[PDB]
């Protein structure tokens, strides 16, 4: 949270200022991995996060990542199959049709109930603001108000 | 304390809170459709595989005829509709409605005689045979008209729809068929151009009978997808006439009623319930069956619809009887284009490749997954070498809606079987039906429901036993509208996103306010909901057009000038919201444009600038869309968007309108070429300018020389 | 199990230390998904229409406007209350505002966890809800086949957290309704 | 030409990536 | 020049220079 006078600023500047306020978290460059899911590369994700922070904190105004080549493989974009003309596919006997992936059958989880309990409670902060409408003269608009 | 939302039903009826049960705030399901189209074909033929299988001599396809076939012996969907039973139902419907068929036929004929070719420009994307793709209705229509000129088929120039449809019918006989096709040359740039291509008769017939397919998108309430289809221009006019006839029939029917919109659905439901309850005998019981047919269009046969069209037009000129019989004929011999093919990949080589549908069986079936393997194995009999599958039985969604509703109402109107002690009647609309049975006990009501189910089996109408249930009369649902104890709770119509229509500032504001007011009037929107809708629309309007209140702290290119205008203008409540002014719209004044609403509060110079009669942000040619309906005003906020035989017609008509400003508003009248009229009016304009001093001698001499070059001196 | 999470630091929210982890995840979207996410605000509308209807009904029962009476009560009407949840097998009541927040959160979750599974489950369970309503009112409902409806509903309960939690909640509410029918 | 690329196996060549990505990846050996 | 490392499943190859032999 960064308290402000209300002036609206570009999201890049807002993120830069919020990170600047919390400099200890921004400058943290030694990760302490807690749990890597199944296949995600800790190094790829951490380097991508550091690139994000550096891009947000740079003096420039463009939000594009400054690597554009490490991020190609960190996001897994580079691991995409290469299209080939249909003839080679017909002749290649090892090119089959991938079996459909069926969603896993899972059981009830205790975190959905906790989320339902927590999200439907009053907080000290409201993010809902709406425009104004013209004055009300009829009683019907009074009851609506 | 563990919150349970369903507990809100303990103290409130489910119907009252049914709105929350409906998920209409998330993302509707979205999709290749080749597998779904093949599945639809397989299902359609499975329900008809006990009929008659033959070979279509005209096209060479494999045709299946379930009509007049064996009666069903199980509870699976059946397409074996007996013709005699359908004729019985239609004869009963005629008996209960004297001269409704004749009146509808006469009205359809009279409207057809007046309809023009341009009427086919209305609708959605249509299949274009010249390119074998999906293109807007106007694009397909003008492409077909142009390609018919190359074949000496000049019925489009005759005006009315009858000559154009006659030339469409004639085109099916031409030994060849010449047209203009888009060819891409690599010059490296891929340049498309028109080439005079030819196709023999059989390919043209296949293209005309062909139905393009895709996967229906944003179909909420269904876990799995289906196949939606679009037809070409060859069947558009005939389908239009047959649908007009069916609508003429079904508007009079009280079971279906004139297709109801808005809150007329509530009136229909209430009238049906009250009428049935009144009809209920003393001490008897009335049971309402909330029914739902799923994939009921796959068991409806175009041959049955041909029979209904023949029966409906019993007393009509043979020309109209033949005209109305062409849409069923072209639907019984339809061809289903199959998606875009399957994709096969090897992960040991990280390679992928799409297999075009014409080459579905060029690969051994062992290289497909099990479900696709079985699908293709069952599809092989009806597969065409050109990458399509013949689909004779069944009907795709949205083609014959009024006619299918007429058939359903005919089924409803039987009202009894065997003089038993029960009377049934109901409501039918586009695959959704609700039934009511009055009898002397629950057992007799269930007997009546069973009899109705069996009777519907005889007409090709199948009702889902999994989706249909029954209860005592007084609580049911129809067309996603829940009636309970005289209270109707329609809560399945998603309120359209209250955002700018994206045409221009003034028009967008007028459209948004009119939409909110229309929602209040029709969809039972309450006051507070309408006010919140106004607030949300104003937020979206300010976000889109970068028009926030001048007193706000927002920054931007336009916001700087808005802030300047905030203080340079004394009267602050008269500014339009697009100029940083305050919104003053409330429930009472949703029908008055804000330009008028703020006219008295506008500053003397602000109105002049905004309402400057000669300002650059308005052009005449941008007024075409002013009508289509919203009420607004002309001003600096009335600009248009940049543009992202097409140009021929575009420029010719633009010049026609420019010369005569009346052609834009009302249809011109004349029995002569447009060129001669243009020349004559230009001569008159030049003479008037020369007389009034607006033009010089040399200019008029040049104009006359040009006119002579045209050849009208 | 889908999140790679690091420990990036610690904070003093109110003078007390709290670890600050960073949850990292690779996901995918579509332009249509982004668009429909932009339209999550309609949840607000969905959450007011409902409440408005409720108030309207009360305003119909007694002449004067019942909004004040419905929310906090008045001289001649106690505030409206709704059964919100349960604890130790005993149902708990809450104010109209609590039910309002529950409805709004339900709509928000429908948006957040919305996919083909949720649409299918809601559409198919609507039928069971209406059948239960008919049972409550003693309308003598009949079913042409029940196992087909149950299978259609259950084919959508695979991995969507909201669908599975909704099935659990539906079972709990159905048990409570059966007990209420007994009495 | 397009067919000859895959018929002779010329297309089945491993892609070269910057050494940083390869080092960060434990699967490469 | 260094050594060469490879991932067969991803079909990727990379060259580790001599200075980066122990990284
Ligand atoms: Mg229904």
mmCIF file with all atom_site columns, C-alpha atoms in Angstrom, chain B residues 378-477:
data_model
loop_
_atom_site.group_PDB
_atom_site.id
_atom_site.type_symbol
_atom_site.label_atom_id
_atom_site.label_alt_id
_atom_site.label_comp_id
_atom_site.label_asym_id
_atom_site.label_entity_id
_atom_site.label_seq_id
_atom_site.pdbx_PDB_ins_code
_atom_site.Cartn_x
_atom_site.Cartn_y
_atom_site.Cartn_z
_atom_site.occupancy
_atom_site.B_iso_or_equiv
_atom_site.pdbx_formal_charge
_atom_site.auth_seq_id
_atom_site.auth_comp_id
_atom_site.auth_asym_id
_atom_site.auth_atom_id
_atom_site.pdbx_PDB_model_num
ATOM 1   C CA . UNK B 1 378 ? -18.581 -44.754 -38.365 1.00 0.00 ? 378 UNK B CA 1
ATOM 2   C CA . UNK B 1 379 ? -18.391 -41.679 -40.637 1.00 0.00 ? 379 UNK B CA 1
ATOM 3   C CA . UNK B 1 380 ? -16.711 -43.485 -43.541 1.00 0.00 ? 380 UNK B CA 1
ATOM 4   C CA . UNK B 1 381 ? -19.984 -44.561 -45.257 1.00 0.00 ? 381 UNK B CA 1
ATOM 5   C CA . UNK B 1 382 ? -21.188 -40.943 -45.574 1.00 0.00 ? 382 UNK B CA 1
ATOM 6   C CA . UNK B 1 383 ? -17.803 -39.352 -46.346 1.00 0.00 ? 383 UNK B CA 1
ATOM 7   C CA . UNK B 1 384 ? -17.424 -37.530 -49.665 1.00 0.00 ? 384 UNK B CA 1
ATOM 8   C CA . UNK B 1 385 ? -14.080 -37.472 -51.456 1.00 0.00 ? 385 UNK B CA 1
ATOM 9   C CA . UNK B 1 386 ? -14.092 -33.654 -51.517 1.00 0.00 ? 386 UNK B CA 1
ATOM 10  C CA . UNK B 1 387 ? -13.935 -33.358 -47.721 1.00 0.00 ? 387 UNK B CA 1
ATOM 11  C CA . UNK B 1 388 ? -17.653 -33.244 -46.874 1.00 0.00 ? 388 UNK B CA 1
ATOM 12  C CA . UNK B 1 389 ? -20.220 -35.615 -45.380 1.00 0.00 ? 389 UNK B CA 1
ATOM 13  C CA . UNK B 1 390 ? -23.739 -36.080 -46.712 1.00 0.00 ? 390 UNK B CA 1
ATOM 14  C CA . UNK B 1 391 ? -26.315 -35.248 -44.018 1.00 0.00 ? 391 UNK B CA 1
ATOM 15  C CA . UNK B 1 392 ? -29.794 -35.962 -45.374 1.00 0.00 ? 392 UNK B CA 1
ATOM 16  C CA . UNK B 1 393 ? -31.773 -36.683 -42.179 1.00 0.00 ? 393 UNK B CA 1
ATOM 17  C CA . UNK B 1 394 ? -32.110 -34.199 -39.359 1.00 0.00 ? 394 UNK B CA 1
ATOM 18  C CA . UNK B 1 395 ? -31.930 -30.427 -39.449 1.00 0.00 ? 395 UNK B CA 1
ATOM 19  C CA . UNK B 1 396 ? -29.342 -27.948 -38.229 1.00 0.00 ? 396 UNK B CA 1
ATOM 20  C CA . UNK B 1 397 ? -30.276 -25.401 -35.585 1.00 0.00 ? 397 UNK B CA 1
ATOM 21  C CA . UNK B 1 398 ? -31.915 -22.123 -36.545 1.00 0.00 ? 398 UNK B CA 1
ATOM 22  C CA . UNK B 1 399 ? -33.011 -23.065 -40.069 1.00 0.00 ? 399 UNK B CA 1
ATOM 23  C CA . UNK B 1 400 ? -36.696 -24.001 -39.652 1.00 0.00 ? 400 UNK B CA 1
ATOM 24  C CA . UNK B 1 401 ? -37.690 -22.594 -36.264 1.00 0.00 ? 401 UNK B CA 1
ATOM 25  C CA . UNK B 1 402 ? -41.222 -21.415 -37.055 1.00 0.00 ? 402 UNK B CA 1
ATOM 26  C CA . UNK B 1 403 ? -41.990 -24.588 -39.019 1.00 0.00 ? 403 UNK B CA 1
ATOM 27  C CA . UNK B 1 404 ? -40.702 -26.806 -36.203 1.00 0.00 ? 404 UNK B CA 1
ATOM 28  C CA . UNK B 1 405 ? -42.787 -24.785 -33.740 1.00 0.00 ? 405 UNK B CA 1
ATOM 29  C CA . UNK B 1 406 ? -45.822 -25.361 -35.966 1.00 0.00 ? 406 UNK B CA 1
ATOM 30  C CA . UNK B 1 407 ? -45.116 -29.099 -35.877 1.00 0.00 ? 407 UNK B CA 1
ATOM 31  C CA . UNK B 1 408 ? -44.793 -29.019 -32.093 1.00 0.00 ? 408 UNK B CA 1
ATOM 32  C CA . UNK B 1 409 ? -48.074 -27.144 -31.723 1.00 0.00 ? 409 UNK B CA 1
ATOM 33  C CA . UNK B 1 410 ? -49.694 -29.691 -34.039 1.00 0.00 ? 410 UNK B CA 1
ATOM 34  C CA . UNK B 1 411 ? -48.475 -32.395 -31.660 1.00 0.00 ? 411 UNK B CA 1
ATOM 35  C CA . UNK B 1 412 ? -49.861 -30.426 -28.703 1.00 0.00 ? 412 UNK B CA 1
ATOM 36  C CA . UNK B 1 413 ? -53.261 -29.934 -30.335 1.00 0.00 ? 413 UNK B CA 1
ATOM 37  C CA . UNK B 1 414 ? -54.166 -33.637 -30.326 1.00 0.00 ? 414 UNK B CA 1
ATOM 38  C CA . UNK B 1 415 ? -55.356 -33.078 -26.739 1.00 0.00 ? 415 UNK B CA 1
ATOM 39  C CA . UNK B 1 416 ? -56.290 -36.724 -26.114 1.00 0.00 ? 416 UNK B CA 1
ATOM 40  C CA . UNK B 1 417 ? -55.817 -40.322 -27.239 1.00 0.00 ? 417 UNK B CA 1
ATOM 41  C CA . UNK B 1 418 ? -58.541 -42.958 -27.284 1.00 0.00 ? 418 UNK B CA 1
ATOM 42  C CA . UNK B 1 419 ? -61.188 -40.778 -25.609 1.00 0.00 ? 419 UNK B CA 1
ATOM 43  C CA . UNK B 1 420 ? -59.365 -41.250 -22.312 1.00 0.00 ? 420 UNK B CA 1
ATOM 44  C CA . UNK B 1 421 ? -60.130 -39.235 -19.174 1.00 0.00 ? 421 UNK B CA 1
ATOM 45  C CA . UNK B 1 422 ? -57.522 -36.517 -19.622 1.00 0.00 ? 422 UNK B CA 1
ATOM 46  C CA . UNK B 1 423 ? -57.017 -33.379 -21.705 1.00 0.00 ? 423 UNK B CA 1
ATOM 47  C CA . UNK B 1 424 ? -53.561 -32.007 -22.510 1.00 0.00 ? 424 UNK B CA 1
ATOM 48  C CA . UNK B 1 425 ? -52.498 -28.629 -23.882 1.00 0.00 ? 425 UNK B CA 1
ATOM 49  C CA . UNK B 1 426 ? -49.366 -26.565 -23.652 1.00 0.00 ? 426 UNK B CA 1
ATOM 50  C CA . UNK B 1 427 ? -46.926 -24.007 -24.983 1.00 0.00 ? 427 UNK B CA 1
ATOM 51  C CA . UNK B 1 428 ? -44.301 -24.575 -27.675 1.00 0.00 ? 428 UNK B CA 1
ATOM 52  C CA . UNK B 1 429 ? -41.480 -22.326 -28.861 1.00 0.00 ? 429 UNK B CA 1
ATOM 53  C CA . UNK B 1 430 ? -38.261 -23.241 -30.655 1.00 0.00 ? 430 UNK B CA 1
ATOM 54  C CA . UNK B 1 431 ? -37.335 -26.626 -29.107 1.00 0.00 ? 431 UNK B CA 1
ATOM 55  C CA . UNK B 1 432 ? -38.789 -25.648 -25.680 1.00 0.00 ? 432 UNK B CA 1
ATOM 56  C CA . UNK B 1 433 ? -42.212 -26.934 -24.637 1.00 0.00 ? 433 UNK B CA 1
ATOM 57  C CA . UNK B 1 434 ? -44.350 -27.007 -21.502 1.00 0.00 ? 434 UNK B CA 1
ATOM 58  C CA . UNK B 1 435 ? -47.311 -29.367 -21.133 1.00 0.00 ? 435 UNK B CA 1
ATOM 59  C CA . UNK B 1 436 ? -50.394 -29.353 -18.907 1.00 0.00 ? 436 UNK B CA 1
ATOM 60  C CA . UNK B 1 437 ? -52.642 -32.381 -18.364 1.00 0.00 ? 437 UNK B CA 1
ATOM 61  C CA . UNK B 1 438 ? -56.005 -32.186 -16.594 1.00 0.00 ? 438 UNK B CA 1
ATOM 62  C CA . UNK B 1 439 ? -57.517 -35.452 -15.374 1.00 0.00 ? 439 UNK B CA 1
ATOM 63  C CA . UNK B 1 440 ? -59.310 -36.985 -12.389 1.00 0.00 ? 440 UNK B CA 1
ATOM 64  C CA . UNK B 1 441 ? -56.255 -38.370 -10.554 1.00 0.00 ? 441 UNK B CA 1
ATOM 65  C CA . UNK B 1 442 ? -52.470 -38.416 -10.717 1.00 0.00 ? 442 UNK B CA 1
ATOM 66  C CA . UNK B 1 443 ? -52.494 -41.840 -12.380 1.00 0.00 ? 443 UNK B CA 1
ATOM 67  C CA . UNK B 1 444 ? -54.622 -40.552 -15.259 1.00 0.00 ? 444 UNK B CA 1
ATOM 68  C CA . UNK B 1 445 ? -52.406 -37.473 -15.596 1.00 0.00 ? 445 UNK B CA 1
ATOM 69  C CA . UNK B 1 446 ? -49.349 -39.719 -15.891 1.00 0.00 ? 446 UNK B CA 1
ATOM 70  C CA . UNK B 1 447 ? -51.218 -41.812 -18.457 1.00 0.00 ? 447 UNK B CA 1
ATOM 71  C CA . UNK B 1 448 ? -51.847 -38.626 -20.425 1.00 0.00 ? 448 UNK B CA 1
ATOM 72  C CA . UNK B 1 449 ? -48.196 -37.601 -20.204 1.00 0.00 ? 449 UNK B CA 1
ATOM 73  C CA . UNK B 1 450 ? -47.155 -41.060 -21.409 1.00 0.00 ? 450 UNK B CA 1
ATOM 74  C CA . UNK B 1 451 ? -49.614 -40.823 -24.300 1.00 0.00 ? 451 UNK B CA 1
ATOM 75  C CA . UNK B 1 452 ? -48.219 -37.407 -25.231 1.00 0.00 ? 452 UNK B CA 1
ATOM 76  C CA . UNK B 1 453 ? -44.672 -38.787 -25.133 1.00 0.00 ? 453 UNK B CA 1
ATOM 77  C CA . UNK B 1 454 ? -45.616 -41.687 -27.405 1.00 0.00 ? 454 UNK B CA 1
ATOM 78  C CA . UNK B 1 455 ? -47.521 -39.407 -29.792 1.00 0.00 ? 455 UNK B CA 1
ATOM 79  C CA . UNK B 1 456 ? -44.531 -37.068 -30.013 1.00 0.00 ? 456 UNK B CA 1
ATOM 80  C CA . UNK B 1 457 ? -42.408 -40.107 -30.858 1.00 0.00 ? 457 UNK B CA 1
ATOM 81  C CA . UNK B 1 458 ? -44.616 -40.594 -33.940 1.00 0.00 ? 458 UNK B CA 1
ATOM 82  C CA . UNK B 1 459 ? -43.905 -37.085 -35.285 1.00 0.00 ? 459 UNK B CA 1
ATOM 83  C CA . UNK B 1 460 ? -40.125 -37.260 -34.862 1.00 0.00 ? 460 UNK B CA 1
ATOM 84  C CA . UNK B 1 461 ? -40.338 -35.110 -31.720 1.00 0.00 ? 461 UNK B CA 1
ATOM 85  C CA . UNK B 1 462 ? -38.244 -36.505 -28.861 1.00 0.00 ? 462 UNK B CA 1
ATOM 86  C CA . UNK B 1 463 ? -38.405 -35.152 -25.309 1.00 0.00 ? 463 UNK B CA 1
ATOM 87  C CA . UNK B 1 464 ? -35.522 -35.531 -22.872 1.00 0.00 ? 464 UNK B CA 1
ATOM 88  C CA . UNK B 1 465 ? -36.552 -37.700 -19.932 1.00 0.00 ? 465 UNK B CA 1
ATOM 89  C CA . UNK B 1 466 ? -33.425 -36.579 -18.067 1.00 0.00 ? 466 UNK B CA 1
ATOM 90  C CA . UNK B 1 467 ? -34.251 -32.882 -18.540 1.00 0.00 ? 467 UNK B CA 1
ATOM 91  C CA . UNK B 1 468 ? -38.055 -33.117 -18.189 1.00 0.00 ? 468 UNK B CA 1
ATOM 92  C CA . UNK B 1 469 ? -39.991 -33.409 -14.932 1.00 0.00 ? 469 UNK B CA 1
ATOM 93  C CA . UNK B 1 470 ? -43.562 -32.981 -13.713 1.00 0.00 ? 470 UNK B CA 1
ATOM 94  C CA . UNK B 1 471 ? -45.415 -31.484 -10.764 1.00 0.00 ? 471 UNK B CA 1
ATOM 95  C CA . UNK B 1 472 ? -48.819 -30.115 -9.828  1.00 0.00 ? 472 UNK B CA 1
ATOM 96  C CA . UNK B 1 473 ? -50.055 -27.222 -11.941 1.00 0.00 ? 473 UNK B CA 1
ATOM 97  C CA . UNK B 1 474 ? -49.057 -23.841 -10.553 1.00 0.00 ? 474 UNK B CA 1
ATOM 98  C CA . UNK B 1 475 ? -45.271 -24.121 -10.712 1.00 0.00 ? 475 UNK B CA 1
ATOM 99  C CA . UNK B 1 476 ? -43.212 -24.783 -13.840 1.00 0.00 ? 476 UNK B CA 1
ATOM 100 C CA . UNK B 1 477 ? -40.712 -23.205 -16.232 1.00 0.00 ? 477 UNK B CA 1
#
